[PDB]
Amino acid sequence: LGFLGAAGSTMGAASMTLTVQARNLLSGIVQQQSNLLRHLLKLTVWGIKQLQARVLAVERYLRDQQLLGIWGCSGKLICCTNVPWNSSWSNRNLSEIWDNMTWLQWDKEISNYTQIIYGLLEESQNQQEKNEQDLLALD
Amino acid sequence: LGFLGAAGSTMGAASMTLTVQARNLLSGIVQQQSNLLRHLLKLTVWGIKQLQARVLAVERYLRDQQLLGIWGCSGKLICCTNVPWNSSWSNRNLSEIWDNMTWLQWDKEISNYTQIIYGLLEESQNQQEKNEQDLLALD
Amino acid sequence: LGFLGAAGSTMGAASMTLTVQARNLLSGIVQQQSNLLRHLLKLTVWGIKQLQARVLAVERYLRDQQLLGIWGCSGKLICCTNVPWNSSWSNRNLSEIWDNMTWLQWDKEISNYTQIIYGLLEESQNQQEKNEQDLLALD
Amino acid sequence: ENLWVTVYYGVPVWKDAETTLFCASDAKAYETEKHNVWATHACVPTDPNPQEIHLENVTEEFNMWKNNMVEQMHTDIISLWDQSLKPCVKLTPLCVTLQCTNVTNNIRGELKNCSFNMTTELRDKKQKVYSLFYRLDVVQINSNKEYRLINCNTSAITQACPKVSFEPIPIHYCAPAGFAILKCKDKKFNGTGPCPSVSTVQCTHGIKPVVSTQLLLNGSLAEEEVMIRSENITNNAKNILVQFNTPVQINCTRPNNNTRKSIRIGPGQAFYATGDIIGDIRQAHCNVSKATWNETLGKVVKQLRKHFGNNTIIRFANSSGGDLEVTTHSFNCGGEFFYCNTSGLFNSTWISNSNDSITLPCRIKQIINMWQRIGQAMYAPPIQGVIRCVSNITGLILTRDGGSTNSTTETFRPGGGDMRDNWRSELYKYKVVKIEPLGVAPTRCKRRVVG
Amino acid sequence: YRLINCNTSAITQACPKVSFEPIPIHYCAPAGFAILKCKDKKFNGTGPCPSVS
Ligand SMILES: *[C@@H]1O[C@H](CO)[C@@H](O[C@@H]2O[C@H](CO)[C@@H](O[C@@H]3O[C@H](CO[C@H]4O[C@H](CO[C@H]5O[C@H](CO)[C@@H](O)[C@H](O)[C@@H]5O)[C@@H](O)[C@H](O[C@H]5O[C@H](CO)[C@@H](O)[C@H](O)[C@@H]5O)[C@@H]4O)[C@@H](O)[C@H](O[C@H]4O[C@H](CO)[C@@H](O)[C@H](O)[C@@H]4O)[C@@H]3O)[C@H](O)[C@H]2NC(C)=O)[C@H](O)[C@H]1NC(C)=O
Ligand SMILES: *[C@@H]1O[C@H](CO)[C@@H](O[C@@H]2O[C@H](CO)[C@@H](O[C@@H]3O[C@H](CO[C@H]4O[C@H](CO[C@H]5O[C@H](CO)[C@@H](O)[C@H](O)[C@@H]5O)[C@@H](O)[C@H](O[C@H]5O[C@H](CO)[C@@H](O)[C@H](O)[C@@H]5O)[C@@H]4O)[C@@H](O)[C@H](O[C@H]4O[C@H](CO)[C@@H](O)[C@H](O)[C@@H]4O)[C@@H]3O)[C@H](O)[C@H]2NC(C)=O)[C@H](O)[C@H]1NC(C)=O
Ligand SMILES: *[C@@H]1O[C@H](CO)[C@@H](O[C@@H]2O[C@H](CO)[C@@H](O[C@@H]3O[C@H](CO[C@H]4O[C@H](CO[C@H]5O[C@H](CO)[C@@H](O)[C@H](O)[C@@H]5O)[C@@H](O)[C@H](O[C@H]5O[C@H](CO[C@H]6O[C@H](CO)[C@@H](O)[C@H](O)[C@@H]6O)[C@@H](O)[C@H](O)[C@@H]5O)[C@@H]4O)[C@@H](O)[C@H](O)[C@@H]3O)[C@H](O)[C@H]2NC(C)=O)[C@H](O)[C@H]1NC(C)=O
Ligand SMILES: *[C@@H]1O[C@H](CO)[C@@H](O[C@@H]2O[C@H](CO)[C@@H](O[C@@H]3O[C@H](CO[C@H]4O[C@H](CO)[C@@H](O)[C@H](O)[C@@H]4O)[C@@H](O)[C@H](O[C@H]4O[C@H](CO)[C@@H](O)[C@H](O)[C@@H]4O)[C@@H]3O)[C@H](O)[C@H]2NC(C)=O)[C@H](O)[C@H]1NC(C)=O
Ligand SMILES: *[C@@H]1O[C@H](CO)[C@@H](O[C@@H]2O[C@H](CO)[C@@H](O[C@@H]3O[C@H](CO[C@H]4O[C@H](CO[C@H]5O[C@H](CO)[C@@H](O)[C@H](O)[C@@H]5O)[C@@H](O)[C@H](O)[C@@H]4O)[C@@H](O)[C@H](O)[C@@H]3O)[C@H](O)[C@H]2NC(C)=O)[C@H](O)[C@H]1NC(C)=O
Ligand SMILES: *[C@@H]1O[C@H](CO)[C@@H](O[C@@H]2O[C@H](CO)[C@@H](O[C@@H]3O[C@H](CO)[C@@H](O)[C@H](O[C@H]4O[C@H](CO)[C@@H](O)[C@H](O)[C@@H]4O)[C@@H]3O)[C@H](O)[C@H]2NC(C)=O)[C@H](O)[C@H]1NC(C)=O
Ligand SMILES: *[C@@H]1O[C@H](CO)[C@@H](O[C@@H]2O[C@H](CO)[C@@H](O[C@@H]3O[C@H](CO[C@H]4O[C@H](CO)[C@@H](O)[C@H](O)[C@@H]4O)[C@@H](O)[C@H](O)[C@@H]3O)[C@H](O)[C@H]2NC(C)=O)[C@H](O)[C@H]1NC(C)=O
Ligand SMILES: *[C@@H]1O[C@H](CO)[C@@H](O[C@@H]2O[C@H](CO)[C@@H](O[C@@H]3O[C@H](CO[C@H]4O[C@H](CO)[C@@H](O)[C@H](O)[C@@H]4O)[C@@H](O)[C@H](O)[C@@H]3O)[C@H](O)[C@H]2NC(C)=O)[C@H](O)[C@H]1NC(C)=O
Ligand SMILES: *[C@@H]1O[C@H](CO)[C@@H](O[C@@H]2O[C@H](CO)[C@@H](O[C@@H]3O[C@H](CO)[C@@H](O)[C@H](O)[C@@H]3O)[C@H](O)[C@H]2NC(C)=O)[C@H](O)[C@H]1NC(C)=O
């Protein structure tokens, strides 16, 4: 275990842990609450690099976390979707990918049409599914 | 379609799409990851306007997204509530508003007591509803 | 009622309200949308203290809200967990704590092993529970 | 009993921490006269509605000497002052040999008519003009007297901006999200301790940065008889703050009719010298209602009785040692800086159980670098016209009786040695805390079995 | 003679290698904001624009 501890292991192992990566993603001991505590101008070059790094920290976290909210998966770490898998994406079989490719390799295998999957993802799970209440919310 | 593509269409159409507005709300191509990449002082007037604009970006997104979390609607884009509609708000009927007013007009029709609705919203759906486990969580 | 209105009352009362504290946690009237509106250098000492305070505002909100998301409790304000309570933490009984300690006192009673509880919290409710679909997601 | 853990978001608990606060004030200077040295060109506007909640059942402990809101206050004013002098006219050319003379002894002399040689607009040519300067701001060198500015020896000099108000206006300190400021609503609050009446206001009261020495002005006063606060009583050494219940009124005025003489020293830059005086020379003064003063000084020795050797002899002496600018009631008024002799107020002694009005002599200084800051001093231009200040005096500052090992009696003489204690007279009741909304508690409740 | 500005304010030389040529600068909105364009060709002073983008 550890942060990215299973980065080189098979995809089945990264499926098993996963939180250790998600936990250490927003806040860090490195930030350490700023201030010297314990000259009186904090306009130094260091303060500029820190604050612009604290911004992109939450700017990149919220850019990805906004994606989880529009897919109905905000509350959980792994959610299933109602989008069928299209064979043009990969020809490999069920146990052939989860035990032989590792995630590091997999991100390069879908990076071509990865944005296209994201487009179809907002539709089937939250554009129609959240709409389907119309008939079932009350009759 | 498109960003605000149904801003002028009836409320029934904005109900149908809606994500295109919600998607392009936090992150933008305009931000474009800052830095020149490809004089050594980034204290320029431009860097001040950009960073203060990136802050109010997530400051306004999280101010509204915090409201969705205290209503039990964080995970989804459209959730139903257990607050009955009070007739003093509007006298119009079910199909009379969704097909004749457009949202742009509607926001002006509730802006007077809109904050009062928000107050009652935290109560019935999350102050009582999340509390109701007391009896049902375990007997 | 009011912000922290039940800070001195019993834990059963803070259980009853609670939102008033959670609501006034991210956004404030104090921030008041900056700008003078209504000399042309905003590099003043005031602008530095404000912006660094607006950052730690959402930096502390998202650091805690990230914890609610990895526990499956993001959408709601009070969620139950599948972690059994370990007697070494407190020897007191069910009605003995909720009616005699107040939260202010309680945070000092668990602050020693509070981080250890958080570790076990990610596991039983989201490391195993979200994984349990494997057998039940489809057979 | 299968007790399960349950999470609660928004739990009212806090831990003592100190974060960065910011400014708040409504419509103040605005269009007619702006450019205040403190409020800058823009402060975040205060909400018209103040939020105060009387936290029930809570007994949080305060500490006003280990509180960091006063230290945040201190470093803010210094950085705020230096930012309001940085873009202005520097008076480096003002360091030349000065040949000065008295004024109308008529053979009474405390200012000198100075002639000196100074650069003009064109760098090539020079110009000679006169100017008046107050005593002590200039010193001799070695028939015709020869003088030099007292600051040209030490650090540099920069003129204060001509259209800048040094008037203290209320500045509000307020917390950041997830933080709250706790107010001590307990009227009697001996030093610091557990306060039974706490509030969690989001924003402090109206705090004015009254730059004062030894005696405080325009401050806050609790309703009970005068309060006495010491970090440690009996450590003769630590200074003593004093809060009144009713403030005394002291009015001060400079009768000198200064004319404005602007002489350029190069381009755009213009030195504002004291012109020629109109009217007979009159020393600056301060009025104190002798009736009102005698009782305020009495209520203190009554409160001090129960804190110093019970019934015994309490005397008041003039400052005691020190430098001329720290042992007098220094302050700013209208732009000119007064230094009044306090020996006339701390001379009486009472023990064992239309109207006359005391007056105080005051001298004026135009060269200043405050907070013992040896970095850079500033020249305050003379204020053209009439001067009159009318501010309440609400606080005090006292000091030692040397090191009298036990013995017969106790004496307390004024000594506003530091500036940060002045704001401690306004911040004794406040303290900021960090809200921690995450609380975990057990209850016999678990969510669905599989999911 | 004398420079006309030495009478008034100070003076500072323009940098030697600085282009004063106007190049296109784009103004664009922050997240949660949008800029509305009047696509109505005839637009007397200002009023309700039927063609917005
Ligand atoms: C502790 O607190 C006390 C109390 O606040 C404080 O004492 C105050 O100190 C400030 C300065 O620090 C004083 O303010 C200055 O006042 C200067 C003198 O003018 C004053 O009185 C005017 C009287 O007007 C009445 O009568 C006239 C005719 O006589 C009549 O026309 C009026 O209508 C009215 O009936 C008063 O008007 C004036 O201010 C207001 O109105 C005038 C116009 O009428 C306007 O020009 C002002 O801008 C203002 O709206 C003022 O109250 C004043 O000169 C000075 O600076 C201004 O004028 C100069 C002159 O050239 C300008 O150059 C400059 O740009 C400014 O415009 C400033 O306003 C204040 O008066 C004291 N107390 C009072 C009574 O409030 C202590 O200082 C505090 N403690 C400490 C630490 O010192
Ligand atoms: C409204 O808009 C109009 C239109 O844009 C605008 O007018 C333009 O104004 C800008 C300046 O503000 C002009 O740009 C300047 O041009 C200077 C003169 O050189 C120009 O013409 C050169 C012609 O080259 C051809 O022929 C030669 C042989 O004669 C041949 O070698 C070439 O291959 C070519 O066939 C042209 O080359 C040159 O710029 C490009 O190429 C040269 C090298 O060939 C290169 O050195 C340049 O960097 C550039 O890539 C240019 O177009 C030019 O001197 C000046 O500054 C540069 O040169 C100086 C000389 O020392 C350097 O010190 C400095 O560092 C720069 O490198 C600058 O480029 C522009 O020409 C105007 N209009 C045109 C035609 O576009 C108005 O100003 C606007 N309104 C307002 C408010 O004014
Ligand atoms: C801080 O210091 C500054 C330092 O500058 C002070 O500012 C200075 O203040 C003094 C005040 O005395 C000013 O002196 C004034 O000078 C003007 C201009 O000079 C003309 O008049 C002179 C007259 O002689 C003076 O002294 C005799 C001595 O007995 C007096 O009797 C007489 O009244 C005068 O005070 C002339 O000498 C001069 O010469 C030319 O014109 C003459 C015109 O006729 C005069 O003299 C004849 C005799 O020759 C008389 O009969 C006749 O009545 C008249 O007086 C001409 O004869 C001669 O041949 C020449 O052609 C000038 O005309 C005087 O008018 C004032 O009376 C006074 O002396 C300084 O000027 C001034 N500084 C500057 C900037 O110049 C400042 O005041 C101080 N702080 C304070 C408190 O403000
Ligand atoms: C030296 O001390 C004397 C005696 O205090 C002062 O004379 C008093 O000056 C004060 C302020 O300079 C005056 O105080 C207040 O005036 C209020 C004005 O009314 C309303 O509108 C204003 C402007 O919007 C509001 O700010 C204000 O809150 C009110 O809504 C009165 O209404 C105040 O009275 C009561 O209510 C307030 C509300 O919180 C309370 O805080 C007060 O304690 C009080 O219960 C208040 O009176 C006052 O009128 C003057 N007289 C007296 C006898 O107090 C000198 O000005 C002062 N000098 C200096 C510079 O320190
Ligand atoms: C300002 O800057 C100046 C120059 O840098 C500083 O120097 C002094 O400036 C004053 C003028 O303000 C000088 O005093 C004047 O000297 C005049 C002539 O000087 C010459 O002769 C002097 C002797 O006088 C005889 O000749 C004159 C000729 O007019 C006759 O009128 C007399 O009756 C005598 O016969 C010599 O001493 C001098 O060296 C010259 O050779 C004189 O006419 C004026 O009456 C006046 O005295 C002064 O000499 C300059 N230098 C000195 C030693 O200070 C000046 O200090 C700067 N600022 C100050 C502090 O003023
Ligand atoms: C502390 O306070 C005490 C008083 O409680 C004070 O003692 C008094 O000092 C004053 C001033 O020095 C004395 O008044 C003088 O009395 C003498 C005669 O004894 C007169 O000659 C003096 O008159 C001259 O000076 C007056 C101004 O001071 C002029 O107005 C007058 O026209 C004369 O020129 C003057 O009246 C007073 O006698 C004593 N004693 C008492 C009981 O009043 C003491 O000095 C104070 N100490 C300090 C350092 O503050
Ligand atoms: C404000 O009021 C507060 C509340 O009273 C004050 O706090 C108190 O401060 C004292 C001194 O710091 C604390 O302890 C005291 O200790 C003395 C010394 O005891 C020893 O010596 C005596 C004889 O001299 C002997 O009899 C004892 O047995 C010891 O050997 C005691 O005499 C006192 O009774 C007392 O215990 C108090 O505990 C403390 N009170 C509390 C808990 O609040 C505070 O000092 C006041 N001043 C300020 C500026 O805050
Ligand atoms: C661009 O075109 C716009 C659309 O036409 C212009 O807006 C119009 O502006 C006028 C003037 O501001 C508005 O009101 C007018 O008022 C006059 C005055 O009426 C009174 O006096 C007359 C006699 O002089 C009398 O007959 C009346 O009874 C009144 O007593 C009227 O004569 C006009 O008919 C008209 O009512 C228009 O309402 C306004 N139109 C609208 C609603 O858009 C705009 O001015 C043009 N220019 C610019 C720069 O935008
Ligand atoms: C400060 O200077 C002011 C004048 O600028 C002095 O104020 C005046 O003090 C007298 C004291 O008798 C006041 O007289 C009486 O005031 C009452 C109201 O309090 C009034 O009812 C009487 O008719 C009579 O006028 C006078 O009003 C007052 N002026 C004002 C407007 O404040 C003041 O005394 C000086 N400070 C000291 C040390 O005395």
Ligand SMILES: *[C@@H]1O[C@H](CO)[C@@H](O)[C@H](O)[C@H]1NC(C)=O
């Ligand atoms: C997958 O989608 C692509 C693009 O629409 C399409 O060309 C392809 O035939 C699809 N394959 C199937 C049958 O899932």
Ligand SMILES: *[C@@H]1O[C@H](CO)[C@@H](O)[C@H](O)[C@H]1NC(C)=O
């Ligand atoms: C709606 O609420 C308002 C405010 O409480 C009340 O006056 C009104 O009668 C209510 N109408 C109904 C019956 O829903």
Ligand SMILES: *[C@@H]1O[C@H](CO)[C@@H](O)[C@H](O)[C@H]1NC(C)=O
């Ligand atoms: C609680 O956990 C601690 C640490 O693993 C363990 O020592 C203790 O025996 C446990 N108590 C029980 C039985 O819950």
Ligand SMILES: *[C@@H]1O[C@H](CO)[C@@H](O)[C@H](O)[C@H]1NC(C)=O
């Ligand atoms: C103050 O008292 C001292 C003696 O302690 C005395 O020498 C001095 O002249 C008095 N006056 C002042 C204001 O220093």
Ligand SMILES: *[C@@H]1O[C@H](CO)[C@@H](O)[C@H](O)[C@H]1NC(C)=O
């Ligand atoms: C002198 O002061 C007293 C107390 O403040 C006051 O009552 C009296 O009116 C004042 N002077 C006179 C005689 O009016």
